Design a protein around this motif. Structure first.
Motif, mmCIF file in Angstrom:
data_model
loop_
_atom_site.group_PDB
_atom_site.id
_atom_site.type_symbol
_atom_site.label_atom_id
_atom_site.label_comp_id
_atom_site.label_asym_id
_atom_site.label_seq_id
_atom_site.Cartn_x
_atom_site.Cartn_y
_atom_site.Cartn_z
ATOM 1 N N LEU A 92 32.664 40.535 38.902
ATOM 2 C CA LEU A 92 33.460 39.414 38.787
ATOM 3 C C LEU A 92 33.132 38.132 39.052
ATOM 4 O O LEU A 92 31.963 37.980 39.427
ATOM 5 N N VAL A 110 31.212 33.538 32.329
ATOM 6 C CA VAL A 110 30.760 33.821 30.983
ATOM 7 C C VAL A 110 31.882 33.815 30.207
ATOM 8 O O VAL A 110 31.982 33.148 28.800
ATOM 9 N N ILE A 111 33.333 34.284 30.337
ATOM 10 C CA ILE A 111 34.416 34.022 29.709
ATOM 11 C C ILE A 111 34.834 32.619 29.608
ATOM 12 O O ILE A 111 35.004 32.119 28.393
ATOM 13 N N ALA A 114 32.395 30.496 27.114
ATOM 14 C CA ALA A 114 32.623 30.717 25.716
ATOM 15 C C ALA A 114 34.033 30.252 25.299
ATOM 16 O O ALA A 114 34.097 29.206 24.271
ATOM 17 N N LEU A 115 35.010 30.431 25.718
ATOM 18 C CA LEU A 115 36.306 29.954 25.537
ATOM 19 C C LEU A 115 36.281 28.598 25.536
ATOM 20 O O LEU A 115 37.213 27.854 24.804
ATOM 21 N N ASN A 169 47.287 37.651 23.702
ATOM 22 C CA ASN A 169 46.243 38.330 24.269
ATOM 23 C C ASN A 169 46.487 38.475 25.733
ATOM 24 O O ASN A 169 45.777 38.277 26.805
ATOM 25 N N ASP A 199 46.406 40.613 27.744
ATOM 26 C CA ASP A 199 45.353 41.059 28.284
ATOM 27 C C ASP A 199 44.256 39.867 29.142
ATOM 28 O O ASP A 199 44.382 39.781 30.160
ATOM 29 N N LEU A 200 43.859 39.193 28.180
ATOM 30 C CA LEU A 200 43.072 38.126 28.536
ATOM 31 C C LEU A 200 43.656 37.343 29.650
ATOM 32 O O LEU A 200 43.010 36.913 30.821
ATOM 33 N N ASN A 216 45.810 37.941 31.923
ATOM 34 C CA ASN A 216 46.027 38.762 33.109
ATOM 35 C C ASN A 216 44.434 39.093 33.629
ATOM 36 O O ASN A 216 44.308 39.456 34.683
ATOM 37 N N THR A 217 43.364 38.906 32.642
ATOM 38 C CA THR A 217 42.198 38.994 33.119
ATOM 39 C C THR A 217 41.617 37.932 33.710
ATOM 40 O O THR A 217 40.657 37.742 34.590
ATOM 41 N N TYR A 226 43.283 37.698 37.421
ATOM 42 C CA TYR A 226 42.532 38.452 38.150
ATOM 43 C C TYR A 226 41.070 37.946 38.504
ATOM 44 O O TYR A 226 40.680 37.492 39.297
ATOM 45 N N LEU A 227 40.386 37.937 37.381
ATOM 46 C CA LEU A 227 39.005 37.391 37.447
ATOM 47 C C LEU A 227 38.905 36.237 38.044
ATOM 48 O O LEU A 227 37.658 35.971 38.452
ATOM 49 N N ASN A 233 41.129 34.872 40.517
ATOM 50 C CA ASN A 233 41.668 34.924 42.034
ATOM 51 C C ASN A 233 40.747 35.617 42.992
ATOM 52 O O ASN A 233 40.542 35.120 44.045
ATOM 53 N N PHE A 234 40.079 36.809 42.436
ATOM 54 C CA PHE A 234 39.275 37.522 43.144
ATOM 55 C C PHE A 234 37.868 37.268 43.165
ATOM 56 O O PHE A 234 37.242 37.778 43.779
#
Ligand SMILES: Nc1nc2c(ncn2[C@@H]2O[C@H](COP(=O)(O)CP(=O)(O)OP(=O)(O)O)[C@@H](O)[C@H]2O)c(=O)[nH]1
Ligand SMILES: [Mg+2]
Ligand SMILES: [Zn+2]
Ligand SMILES: [Zn+2]
Ligand SMILES: [Zn+2]
Lengths: 107, 177, 97, 112, 270, 171, 551, 84
Positions: free
Chosen positions: B49, B55-56, B59-60, B94, B96-97, B99-100, B103-104, B106-107
């Motif tokens: 994490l 990395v996310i 690109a984004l 998305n 999912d993203l 929420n990722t 999380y990604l 916050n933690f």
RNA sequence: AAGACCAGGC
DNA sequence: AAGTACT
DNA sequence: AGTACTTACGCCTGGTCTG
């Protein structure tokens, strides 16, 4: 090369493939009276070096099995003594184009 | 589907599909010896994490850019700053993203591509396997026990002392908030 | 009307690939079946709706294809299977050459 | 030499009727009947035993008999045969299909 | 049968004739790579005719008052008589037309001269003729080099197979050989100037055409020659509606069956 | 645990879009039928990397209609949990039978009886919770779970995890 | 084809793997227990019993249900069923091998009968050809009838090496009906080789033994040539025939299964009841029989299994046998749509490449054009015109995959077209079509022509293109096929059109000429003797359509 | 396996089967509302537009030429000479 | 509707 | 009925 | 030397009888 007259004894012949590398062949008189290679039809063949061969394949991108074959007993095959694997180049005349090059592998 | 870099010649009897566990036995699709598109071999890709968060993000972002090359013709602060990057370059469906990223983000345990850089330059001296060299990077750890227990695949591959220095240098580099 | 062996043999002659396929399929049989990417059979239980696909036995749900083939052919196969012979339909060549 | 004969003979069967056929054809045939090794007959007892996949020999004189012994010795079929594809409803590798056609996106730009 | 027996056979991109396995059957469709469609009966003049006539027609000797080209034909005629460096090209040309002879007489023993071949040269010239209103009175304007050195450069571009090696670029010369003979035959200096008074224009044209008209007669990698061949035979085998030997349909049956006990066995011994 | 796997996909394009900027449409459709997908063999396709250098190769034209087919070779960030994996998340729902923690794009659930003992479940709480000697677990509380087993389903992946081992519990 | 969309990717068949069914898979695959032999009538009540055909296999009565697979009749293919036999049976077509294999391996320990040890054998193990190994092998050990234990190695014939054990003599074997028998040799010992036995000896054969013999560890193990679980082709392979309701219509197949089933239960109920030891093997032959006839019926062992009324019985094999059947008469050649046939007649007024299509047919045959700005207008006109006037159409189809039948539909004259929609329209002047005359034995027995809609009822073709089709007008009929894809036509006009066929390669010369009148006449008109005067010369000029207007 | 644009060995010219299929294929697309890369001199028949795109060699396609052993060579409608 | 024959057309 | 191939 | 084995043009239109 050995030349028998009327024939050999079946007890004898089974002694040729017993001393390799060395190779032997058996010819009857009556079949050598005329050279079969001199006949109007039978065109001339030629042995190919294990080099000239490994090339014929690479140039036509051929696998050994996709090649036109000649009999291990085929008359001319004997006149030159081929060996299972040796390739021959058959060069004949053609009413479509003077000369046509062909190949015959052995089996 | 989305095919996956190697054509496992399935000869009728598909049966053996091992167990998935922290025995480092992961689906065939995750051995450590997988194949790159160029046709080369390449170690697995283990993202801890807050390294993934980068990395996310990376690109984004470079997406938003090349997404306009053609249009001519602090904790809580990042929650907003990302939701945007998304409502711009994301599928907007998305969930999912989204929420990722929360999380990604916050933690996460690092904000500098420089801090995360050392994290990597450090653990990558272990010879340890990627899944460990990941669980280690994204999991708090004070003792070798809190570690070698929440990451059993370690147990014998490293002395308690060493695995402990590394843990020391982790909380040291562990960027603040 | 009939488009039999002989009339085919001519299209092959002409080298009219597509037209041949057309007479043979889109203008006669033509049928859409499903396969298992594992055991090359028609087994698959396609519920084209809830997308469910399965294929218990070779047990799947993921690796599944769709192919278009002359119904007569499907039948050729089914008839063969019933005689206990297996016609495997695979969508990728693994034997090279 | 044999080929040369087989041909010669066959040629005489078409000339005796005052009809003319261009070499190449009887040639090809004579050849097909001879490459393999000796004299392979154009019949169920010959060319229909060759290494050609099943499905193709299927469409001729022994059908089921031939199919049976295919799943028996688990043969594999290339689907390179004309017949093969015809049976599947696929465009066979024949003239119009001795190749593939693609959209070169690159050249699909300088065109505007 | 014939058909089922050759379906799979077609000409592949490499210009070989194979079936569904990959087995070569012909290394060049028809031993020449030409699509039957582009072919006509032409005559190989070089073959028939007394050794005498041959000379009087194809022989040129720039070193002789009676065997040279009378300047009434070639512009640079009078200034050629004697030139020794030309007499070598001129002599090469002849020692070739000569080889051609023997070669042909070694292939077509019969003496038969009319054979099917690509590119109809007879006509290709005929047009050149009335296409440039060539007058049989005034003289040409071809250097003897112009001629002999273009005819050669012609053969060079009559490509059938294209390979980048020897084994291939060698089959090349072969699949062409027969053609060229005809070629060298019809584009022989004397002929080119004394029979069909071509100018440089005419010639350079006659040449262009031949090359392209040839590159057209080649065979297209795609043709499903197998089926074709079959039909081509079985077809006329249906029109057969019927000196004392097994002959015809019942015979053809025999042949294809590779039958051991033929009704008539005969055998001619010379 | 999150991964960066090298994938590839096949998109069938109608001739209609055989435009000037086709590349553009492809990519775009890549991203519609990928970002947010789910498989048991790949896990969660979350984001396509290096948007730019996406390899398209030459696509072939099918053979009845003009639709062309390109094998889009890309690369992305995936994430698929495992049995025995240790991860921590934020609780979301909490009922008599347990609470569900949310690790990333996924949701891991913990059975009441898969927790410890001294921890009971208080129903008369608001918001609902689980009380202990000293620990208090409810809605927003952060936990660290050990994934005991996984279950793939449609377009997601749930899984059960325990907090009955050591160094496990709240943080 | 089929309709309804599927998220299933779509590919082409590339390889075909021929295997044999393992009773194990056969089971796995099935969805039918198939315990009862009856058809339906749950006590006359219509439906189907979870017995034969539909214990979940396909269906009938126009009712979705195909194991919820719904979709119904069209687009459900069948779903195989299985039916556990009572005792292993032979495979009518494999018998031939099952035998040859035993003569190749001996029982008790089941293993080859010649190892690397024997040299003639070596040469027989390098051969890379199932048909050839198994054929050389067989010939080589069909004669030896003793399981050697010890044989003289590559050294001294004095020294004897040891291998596998059990010299239990090998019995020669012969084929009697559907059973295998062998003697064991003073005086012989004749016993029947029970299927139950053979199976075993095979089951035990070695992995490298399979392969050494023409086989394959994964797709075809010998132990499979012997049936134990029988697949049960679903309705569509053996559909019915209803005369509305309260009657029957069952297919021949659905009977031999019915039989096989009976003959299977009768057996079983004997091995669990009063089992008079060898009064059973009289009803185990019956099964061996049916489970054999079901697949083949034209055996030398006479009995045709004549079904009540003495009608032969259609063995599965029989359905594929050459001509008129599946392979040759269904797959290699089919009946087809968009096709017409009538009588042909000469008409010296058509270009060579044309062909007179009678209006009657031009109005019947159709071409699917796709609505495009280039045509929209023209197309809406045809659509407006209807399916009765000539230049018109008879079917519009929108994206929603629905057929608008132009002859009915309250919206006939209404309709606004939509780019993307298709419009089945009438064949029109100049639609390329494939024309042909059977027997077809030329590229040219089939050529493409320009369609020219004309009155009266006969395909009118030009004279010179006669000899290629090889036709006379003495009442000869011809077939016409109509293309369908914009690319399909392309193939006709670019390779099949008559003008291209002019110079035939089958004889490197032209293949169409000038005959009859035109020929005969063309000579007369030529002669020095023949002179023509102004008044006519002028008309003649006029006739050649490409006359430059220069008398 | 593929083959470099050099070492190329096929026929520099377009085969009838190729051209035949290109036009068809191209028509099909054009007939499907695909974009047309030439000025329609007023044409309205796809296979006719296709004949046009093909004479100004403005057809974005590539003819992959498989060889007997599997390798292929790639030529563009651009390159390929069109005699016929 | 399927399947056997017989007549017949080219 | 024949022709071939296999036993 | 005797016996058995798979085959046999292509398409097309009629009318007739029966388990
Ligand atoms: N497939 C078939 N083609 C046939 C048949 N009868 C004729 N034809 C073809 O039509 C053909 C020509 O000769 P015919 O038999 O018609 C005899 P006829 O005396 O009427 O000929 P003409 O002198 O041309 O009028 C004949 O050669 C075959 O090419 C037939 O029964 N089957
Ligand atoms: Mg007639
Ligand atoms: Zn399956
Ligand atoms: Zn169903
Ligand atoms: Zn034994």
């Amino acid at each position: 090369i050995f030349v028998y007259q009327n024939n050999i004894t079946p007890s004898a012949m089974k002694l040729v493939p017993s001393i390799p590398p060395a190779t032997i062949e058996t010819f009857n008189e009556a079949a050598l009276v005329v050279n079969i290679t001199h006949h109007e039809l039978v065109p001339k063949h030629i042995r190919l070096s294990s080099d000239e061969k490994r090339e014929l394949l690479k140039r036509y991108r051929l696998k050994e099995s996709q090649l036109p074959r000649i009999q291990r007993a085929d008359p001319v095959a004997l006149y030159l003594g081929l060996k299972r694997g040796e390739v021959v180049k058959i060069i004949r005349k053609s009413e479509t184009s003077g000369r046509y090059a062909s190949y015959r592998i052995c089996m | 589907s989305t095919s996956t870099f190697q054509t496992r010649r399935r000869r009728l009897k598909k049966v053996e599909e091992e167990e998935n566990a922290a025995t480092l036995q992961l689906g065939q699709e995750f051995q450590l010896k997988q194949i790159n598109h160029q046709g080369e071999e390449e170690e697995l890709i283990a993202l801890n994490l807050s390294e993934a968060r980068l990395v996310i993000k990376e690109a984004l972002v470079e997406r938003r850019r090349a997404f306009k090359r053609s249009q001519k013709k602090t904790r809580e602060k990042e929650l907003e700053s990302i939701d945007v990057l998304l409502e711009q370059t994301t599928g907007g469906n998305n969930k999912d993203l989204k929420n990722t990223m929360q999380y990604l983000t916050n933690f996460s345990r690092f904000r500098d591509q420089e801090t995360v850089g050392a994290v990597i330059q450090l653990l990558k001296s272990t010879g340890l396997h990627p899944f460990e060299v990941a669980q280690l990077g994204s999991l708090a750890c004070d003792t070798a026990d809190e570690a070698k227990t929440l990451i059993p695949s370690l147990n014998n591959k490293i002395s308690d002392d060493e695995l402990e220095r590394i843990l020391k240098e982790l909380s040291n580099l562990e960027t603040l908030y | 009307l009939r488009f039999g062996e002989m009339e085919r043999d001519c299209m092959i002659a002409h080298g009219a690939a597509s037209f041949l396929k057309e007479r043979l399929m889109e203008a006669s049989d033509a049928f859409r079946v499903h396969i298992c990417g594992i055991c090359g059979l028609m087994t698959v239980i396609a519920k084209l709706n809830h997308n469910q696909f399965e294929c218990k036995g070779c047990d799947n749900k993921i690796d599944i294809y769709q192919i278009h083939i002359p119904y007569a052919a499907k039948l050729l196969f089914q008839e063969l299977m019933a005689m206990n012979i297996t016609p495997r339909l695979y969508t990728d060549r693994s034997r090279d050459f | 030499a044999g080929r040369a004969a087989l041909y010669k003979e066959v040629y005489n069967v078409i000339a005796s009727d005052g009809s003319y056929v261009n070499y190449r054809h009887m040639a090809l045939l004579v050849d097909v009947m001879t490459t393999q090794g000796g004299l392979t007959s154009v019949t169920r007892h010959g060319f229909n035993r060759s290494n050609t996949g099943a499905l193709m020999r299927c469409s001729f004189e022994e059908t089921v008999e031939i199919l049976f012994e295919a799943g028996a010795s688990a043969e594999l079929d290339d689907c390179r045969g004309v017949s093969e594809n015809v049976i599947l409803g696929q465009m066979a590798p024949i003239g119009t299909g001795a190749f593939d056609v693609m959209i070169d996106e690159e050249s699909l730009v300088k065109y505007m | 049968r014939l058909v089922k027996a050759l379906e799979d056979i077609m000409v592949h991109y490499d210009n070989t004739t194979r079936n569904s396995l990959g087995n070569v059957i012909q290394f060049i469709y028809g031993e020449d790579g030409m699509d039957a469609a582009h072919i006509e009966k032409q005559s190989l003049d070089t073959i028939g005719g007394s050794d005498a006539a041959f000379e009087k027609r194809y022989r040129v000797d720039l070193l002789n008052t009676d065997h040279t080209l009378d300047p009434s034909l070639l512009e640079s005629g009078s200034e050629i008589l004697g030139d020794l460096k030309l007499q070598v090209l001129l002599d090469e040309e002849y020692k070739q037309l000569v080889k051609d002879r023997k070669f042909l007489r070694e292939v077509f023993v019969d003496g038969e001269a009319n054979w099917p071949l690509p590119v109809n040269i007879r006509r290709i010239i005929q047009n050149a003729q009335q296409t440039f209103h060539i007058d049989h009175t005034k003289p040409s304007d071809l250097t003897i080099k112009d001629i002999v050195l273009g005819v050669k450069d012609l053969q060079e571009n009559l490509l059938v197979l294209r390979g980048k090696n020897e084994i291939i670029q060698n089959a090349q010369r072969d699949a062409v050989t027969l053609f060229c003979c005809l070629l060298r035959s019809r584009l022989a200096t004397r002929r080119v100037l004394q029979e069909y008074r071509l100018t440089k224009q005419a010639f350079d044209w006659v040449l262009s055409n031949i090359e392209a008209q040839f590159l057209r007669s080649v065979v297209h990698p795609g043709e499903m020659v197998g089926v074709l061949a079959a039909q081509s035979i079985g077809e006329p085998a249906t029109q057969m509606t019927l000196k004392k030997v097994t002959s015809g349909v019942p015979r053809l049956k025999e042949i294809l069956n590779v039958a051991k006990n033929m009704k008539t066995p005969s055998l001619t011994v010379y | 645990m999150f991964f960066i796997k090298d994938l590839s996909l096949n998109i069938t394009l109608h001739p209609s879009f055989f435009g000037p900027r086709m590349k553009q449409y492809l990519k775009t459709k890549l991203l519609e039928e990928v970002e947010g997908s789910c498989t048991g063999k790949f896990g969660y396709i979350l984001c396509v990397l290096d948007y730019d250098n996406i390899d398209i190769q030459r696509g072939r034209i099918l053979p009845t209609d003009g639709s062309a087919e390109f094998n889009v070779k890309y690369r992305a960030v995936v994430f698929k949990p495992f049995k025995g994996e240790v991860v921590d998340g934020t609780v979301v729902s909490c009922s008599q039978h347990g609470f569900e923690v949310q690790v990333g794009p996924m949701k891991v659930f913990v059975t009441k009886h898969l927790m410890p003992q001294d921890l009971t479940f208080n129903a008369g709480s608001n918001p609902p919770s689980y009380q202990s000697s000293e620990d208090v677990i409810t809605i927003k509380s952060r936990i660290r779970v050990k994934i005991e087993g996984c279950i793939s389903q449609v377009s997601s992946i749930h899984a059960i995890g325990s907090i009955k081992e050591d160094y496990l519990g709240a943080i | 084809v089929g309709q309804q969309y599927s998220s299933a990717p779509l590919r082409t068949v590339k390889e075909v793997q021929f295997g044999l069914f393992s009773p194990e898979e056969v089971r796995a695959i099935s969805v039918a227990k198939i315990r009862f032999p009856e058809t339906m009538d749950e006590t006359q009540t219509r439906a189907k019993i979870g017995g034969l055909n539909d214990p979940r296999l396909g269906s009938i009565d126009r009712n979705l249900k195909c194991q919820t697979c719904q979709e119904g009749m069209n687009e459900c293919p069948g779903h195989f069923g299985h039916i556990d036999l009572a005792k292993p049976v032979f495979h009518v077509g494999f018998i031939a091998k099952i035998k040859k294999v035993c003569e190749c391996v001996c029982m008790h320990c089941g293993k080859l009968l010649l190892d690397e040890h024997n040299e003639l054998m070596r040469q027989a193990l390098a051969i890379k050809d199932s048909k050839k190994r198994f054929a050389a092998i067989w010939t080589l050990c069909k004669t030896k009838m003793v399981c050697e234990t010890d044989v003289p190695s590559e050294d001294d014939p004095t020294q004897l090496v040891s291998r596998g054990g059990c010299g239990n003599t090998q019995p020669t074997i012969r084929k009697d009906g559907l059973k295998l028998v062998g003697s064991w040799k003073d005086e012989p010992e004749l016993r029947v080789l029970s299927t139950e036995e053979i199976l075993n000896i095979f089951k035990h054969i070695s992995v490298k033994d399979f392969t050494s013999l023409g086989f394959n560890e994964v797709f075809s193990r010998p132990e499979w040539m012997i049936l134990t679980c029988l697949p049960v082709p679903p309705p569509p392979v053996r559909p019915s025939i209803s005369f509305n309701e309260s009657q029957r219509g069952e297919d021949d197949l659905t009977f031999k299964l019915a039989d096989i089933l009976k003959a299977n239960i009768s057996l079983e109920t004997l091995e669990h009841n009063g089992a008079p030891h060898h009064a059973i093997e009289e009803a185990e032959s019956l099964l061996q029989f049916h489970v054999a006839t079901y697949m083949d019926n034209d055996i030398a062992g006479q009995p045709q299994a004549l079904q009540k009324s003495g009608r032969p019985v259609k063995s599965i094999r029989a359905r594929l046998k050459g001509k008129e059947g599946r392979i040759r008469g269904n797959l290699m050649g089919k009946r087809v749509d968009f096709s017409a046939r009538t009588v042909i007649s000469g008409d010296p007024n058509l270009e060579l490449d044309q062909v007179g299509v009678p209006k009657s047919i031009a109005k019947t045959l159709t071409y699917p054009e796709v609505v495009t700005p280039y045509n929209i207008d023209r197309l809406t006109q045809l659509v407006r015109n209807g399916p009765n006037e000539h230049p018109g159409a008879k079917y519009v189809i929108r994206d929603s995959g629905d057929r608008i039948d132009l002859r009915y539909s309250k919206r006939a004259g209404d309709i606004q077209l939509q780019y993307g929609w298709k419009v089945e329209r009438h064949i029109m002047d100049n639609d390329p079509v494939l024309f042909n005359r059977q027997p077809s034995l030329h590229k040219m027995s089939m050529m493409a022509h320009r369609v020219k809609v004309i009155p009266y009822s006969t395909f009118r073709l030009n004279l010179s293109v006669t000899s290629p089709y090889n036709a006379d007008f003495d009442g000869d009929e011809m077939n016409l096929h109509v293309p369908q894809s914009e690319e399909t036509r392309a193939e006709l006009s670019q390779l099949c059109a008559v003008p291209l066929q002019i110079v035939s390669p089958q004889s490197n010369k032209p293949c169409m000429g000038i005959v009859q009148d035109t020929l005969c006449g063309i000579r007369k008109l030529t002669l020095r003797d023949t002179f023509i005067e102004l008044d006519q010369v002028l008309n003649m000029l006029y006739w050649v359509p490409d006359w430059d207007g220069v008398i | 396996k593929a083959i470099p644009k050099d070492q190329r060995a096929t026929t520099p010219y377009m085969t009838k089967y190729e051209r035949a299929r290109i036009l068809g294929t191209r028509a099909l697309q054009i007939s499907m509302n695909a974009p047309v890369f030439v000025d329609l001199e007023g044409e309205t028949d796809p296979l006719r537009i296709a004949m046009k795109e093909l004479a100004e060699k403005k057809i974005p396609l590539v003819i992959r030429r498989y060889l007997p052993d599997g390798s292929f060579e790639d030529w563009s409608v651009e390159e390929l000479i069109v005699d016929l």
